[PDB]
Design a protein around this ligand. Structure first.
Ligand code: DEE
Length: 126
């Protein structure tokens, strides 16, 4: 169902939250080799997350679930913001620039926290 696929998407999103917090600790500790691996894992998880979100939105469209489509359009828009910030964070890591990395890390936390109001509304609309 669209709802079980949303539950999987929610789980993959929580996996990313878990890995992101482990990465933040590693960055603070200066374990750059660990950060590199966590960043690669996060990219993989965001790819899978976005794939699930798109299939859910396309299915809500085919089902005519107008409230769900509206909410998912809003959420997938904010997901792109998070993606853009994550990409800039990765570039800052490649460049050896911890100041910018810190800033982007913090910004991505705020984009994600703000998104959770939408995420929970979608669950209840589907
Ligand atoms: C960086 C891509 O991910 C996200 O933006 C995201 C996740 C994961 N959960 N909520 C949001 C807005």
């Amino acid at each position: 169902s669209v709802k079980s696929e949303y539950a999987e998407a929610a789980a993959v999103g929580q996996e990313a939250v878990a890995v992101f917090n482990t990465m933040k600790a590693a960055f603070q500790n200066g374990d750059k080799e660990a950060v590199a691996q966590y960043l690669a894992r996060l990219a993989s998880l965001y790819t899978r997350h976005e794939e699930l979100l798109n299939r859910i939105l396309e299915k809500a469209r085919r089902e005519g679930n107008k409230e769900a489509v509206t909410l998912m359009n809003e959420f997938t828009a904010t997901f792109q913001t998070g993606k853009s910030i994550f990409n800039a964070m990765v570039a800052a890591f490649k460049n050896g620039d911890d100041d910018s990395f810190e800033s982007y890390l913090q910004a991505l936390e705020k984009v994600t926290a703000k998104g959770e109001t939408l995420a929970d509304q979608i669950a209840k609309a589907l």
